[PDB]
Amino acid sequence: ARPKLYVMDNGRMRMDKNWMIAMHNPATIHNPNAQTEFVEFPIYTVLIDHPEGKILFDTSCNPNSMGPQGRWAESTQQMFPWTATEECYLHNRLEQLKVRPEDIRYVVASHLHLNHAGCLEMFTNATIIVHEDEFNGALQCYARNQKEGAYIWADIDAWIKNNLQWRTVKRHEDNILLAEGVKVLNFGSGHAWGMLGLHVELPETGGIILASDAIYTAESYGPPIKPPGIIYDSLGYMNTVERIRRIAQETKSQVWFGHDAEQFKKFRKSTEGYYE
Amino acid sequence: ARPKLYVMDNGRMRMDKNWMIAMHNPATIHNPNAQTEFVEFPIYTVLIDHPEGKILFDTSCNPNSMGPQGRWAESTQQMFPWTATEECYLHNRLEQLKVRPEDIRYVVASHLHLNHAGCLEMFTNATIIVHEDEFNGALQCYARNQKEGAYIWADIDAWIKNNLQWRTVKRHEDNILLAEGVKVLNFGSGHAWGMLGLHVELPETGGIILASDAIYTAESYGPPIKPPGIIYDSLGYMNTVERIRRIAQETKSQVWFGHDAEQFKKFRKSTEGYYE
Ligand SMILES: [Co+2]
Ligand SMILES: [Co+2]
Ligand SMILES: [Fe+3]
Ligand SMILES: [Fe+3]
């Protein structure tokens, strides 16, 4: 099999650095009112155009996320603003590749945060692969009518109204062979309730691990590991990072982080080409 | 049957509020360089003068902690400075109660952080009860010559040279009946590797739970729970806080937080009296 892997630029987001690197600049006797920064980071998706079928990793943010009539609560827009041009929208990025939503066989949701699950509702002909604990956690946010937070009620509303077809990865489920050289990695709890990664083995490029928010950046990866402020299971997070490190060394694979500005710049995006 | 419980003022410490309440004030589009604060909080120990023997909960900081020739590293001194008058020193606080180190039968170390295990070395005639995981973790810090962070090399050095007698609480060990109405609570991992609390049943005052850093403050306690930045096991931390809440409700016990300025102000300290 000779697949093509595309990195699609789905805009940028800004947030408190402390979210990304917990306690990045601690206050001191000499700096008692220490300042944080408001850092920019990429929101990207990955399309594996595979002969067995098209696989999508993450879905970025929903077009109608930001704004006065935005699905995102105002507090969320102010803490995690998403800047993107129309071309950065997933549906347009796919269109520029002559890929219709209906052509996606599999969507892998690393987690159900606002900036990874925004456009799940588009893929009504796909099987949405998600960690059961992540699914459960988001569904509770919905049921309890939680309007703030990283789980967008209106996005979840849409998933349900659009009758998405789900395939939950069970807590103790082995990695899933989705297609030749494409494995869903079950990272479990850490950054969120349930994280999924991808291991892709390309004939030419070789091995790629899509870590998503299991590893925000290279600063996160280290060594040493510098965990995020947005974390559900600190222990599981630490374990997941080391697990990823071990797999990378054993499979001689690259590790693609979730939101690393520097790494993203070096990527070949969908406007220039792909990875074989 | 008729004991007296003393609260001993062992000084004040300042640190970044983000340590106490994580992400207490996140940056926004309108406040991108959001400032943290450098808050003050109490360091205290608890003496249970019990007919079966004297029980000490926590040991505060070592007198030789701060300063150019201080045991604490400068970075630590600058991030977590301890201010204390001679009288605030535990040795002095005990002397004013006509209690010699040698008279302590049991020292319960909630955890082995610098602000709780400073003066363990004094109690050479006591049994030091500590969580095995906390003990293990600190001994690793020592063995690896970790000089910075919350585990003071020189402090641990002194514990070993002074030949302290340890009694480790095993990971899955039940609560320990230390004396009539005195009971060691095995909280396990959370704030640190292994946390111990006390439940004291006082004839007059009733039930008291000593939570130490299992719960920093009333703000931590909520509801809802607002976890700290100094955390090892987020899940365990959350579980512990809720376990304490339950025990408190079922035993109609007060919950004494580790570092709550407001609550401490209301405590009757060793200079004014005791709790029966
Ligand atoms: Co996320
Ligand atoms: Co502590
Ligand atoms: Fe993300
Ligand atoms: Fe403390």
Author numbering:
A (entry chain X), B (entry chain A): 8 to 283
Question: What does the primary publication say about this deposited structure?
Answer:
MLLs degrade N-acyl-L-homoserine lactones (AHLs), molecules that are used in a microbial communication system called quorum sensing (QS) to coordinate a variety of behaviors, including virulence and biofilm formation. GcL is a thermostable, highly proficient lactonase with broad substrate specificity (kcat/KM values range between 104 to 106 M–1 s–1) for substrates such as N-butyryl (C4) L-homoserine lactone (HSL) and N-decanoyl (C10)-HSL. The binuclear center, common to all MLLs, is coordinated by five histidine residues and two aspartic acid residues.
Asp122 is also conserved and is involved in coordinating the metal cation. To investigate the importance of these residues, we therefore substituted Tyr223 with phenylalanine and Asp122 with asparagine in GcL, eliminating their role in acid catalysis, and kinetically characterized the resulting GcL variants. The alterations in GcL activity may still suggest that this residue is important, but the interpretation of this effect is complicated by the clear role of this residue in metal coordination. In the case of the Asp122Asn variant, the Asp mechanism is no longer accessible due to the mutation of Asp122, leaving only the terminal hydroxide or concerted mechanisms as potential options. Curiously, in this variant, the activation free energy for the terminal hydroxide mechanism increases substantially, leaving the concerted mechanism as the only energetically plausible pathway with calculated activation free energies within 3 kcal mol–1 of the experimental data. Visual examination of our EVB trajectories indicates that during our simulations, the substituted N122 side chain interacts with and stabilizes the terminal hydroxide ion at the Michaelis complex, contributing to higher calculated activation free energies through reactant state stabilization.
